[PDB]
Ligand binder design. Structure first.
Ligand SMILES: CN1CCN(C(=O)c2cc(Nc3ncc4cc(C(N)=O)n(C5CCCC5)c4n3)cn2C)CC1
Ligand SMILES: [Mg+2]
Length: 258
């Protein structure tokens, strides 16, 4: 693959390490998203193994709720990821659009997330990073996890606006699959309320709020949601439900679709 090969369209998203662009493949007329990262800035920040964790993992996972990486190439200056395109954009933009979600949309995304994370954890891979700006919508409004790296494998290991990160990760202790489960809780909450439960005004404050696990529920939050989120947001990782217990949880089934 090479640049010429594609016509590039409008830009889809901001320069993390470069932008991502809508794009069309000349031969087949295939519409895709082209993540464009300048080598310069990767090396300067030394995250090439993160890139080289996004690539391997996203190409070898195949699941309807995981964004697909089709291939890559580089030139002199830049590395190019060829991604699946998610026509309806991010859950982040949708949340900004509606401010909060209803229970049906929420339970439905939590379910699509739980299956995608279920597949993920079966191959021992853990995402570590399911913010809403990494959740994308397909053409049917199907939720799709993207990004990857930072990432996966076994127990582990290694500025991430803190919000979705669990206590063990924040202190630097040892973590497993359960990190994602806590994130599901932060997400669940965020969807219903419109703001993540440890949202604070400063990194340092947020860090307190997470380590202490201090959040409260606005009054409009139904008994069963609290039940799911309360259960998901425990300090001790091993007292966090497994995904099949989430997928069960009476509230999810009272509200999800399928
Ligand atoms: C109708 N509308 C929904 C879609 N709209 C969008 O502009 C849009 C589409 C997409 N699609 C898309 N597809 C694959 C992606 C892979 C990525 C990625 N970088 O992993 N992104 C990002 C670009 C910025 C946020 C997410 C992707 N975005 C992002 N945006 C911001 C506009 C409003
Ligand atoms: Mg992101």
């Amino acid at each position: 693959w090479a640049l010429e090969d594609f016509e590039i369209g409008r830009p889809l998203g901001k320069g993390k390490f470069g932008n991502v662009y809508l794009a069309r493949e000349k031969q087949s007329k295939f519409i895709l998203a082209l993540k464009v990262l300048f080598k310069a800035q990767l090396e300067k920040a030394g995250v090439e193994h993160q890139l080289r964790r996004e690539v391997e993992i996203q190409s070898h996972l195949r699941h309807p709720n995981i964004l697909r990486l089709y291939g890559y190439f580089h030139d002199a200056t830049r590395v190019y990821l060829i991604l699946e395109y998610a026509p309806l954009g991010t859950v982040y933009r949708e949340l900004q659009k509606l401010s909060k979600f209803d229970e049906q949309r929420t339970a439905t995304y939590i379910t699509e997330l739980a299956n995608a994370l279920s597949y993920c954890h079966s191959k021992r891979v853990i995402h570590r990073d399911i913010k809403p700006e990494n959740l994308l919508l397909g053409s049917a409004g199907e939720l799709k996890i993207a990004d990857f790296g930072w990432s996966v494998h076994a127990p582990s290991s290694r500025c991430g606006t803190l919000d979705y990160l669990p206590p063990e990760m924040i202190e630097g202790r040892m973590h497993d699959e359960k990190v994602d489960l806590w994130s599901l809780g932060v997400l669940c909450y965020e969807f219903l309320v419109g703001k993540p439960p440890f949202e604070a005004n400063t990194y340092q404050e947020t860090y307190k709020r997470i380590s202490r696990v201090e959040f409260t529920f606005p009054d409009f939050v139904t008994e069963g949601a609290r039940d799911l989120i309360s259960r998901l947001l425990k300090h001790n990782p091993s007292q966090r439900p497994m995904l099949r217990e989430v997928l069960e949880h009476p509230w999810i089934t009272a509200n999800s679709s399928k």
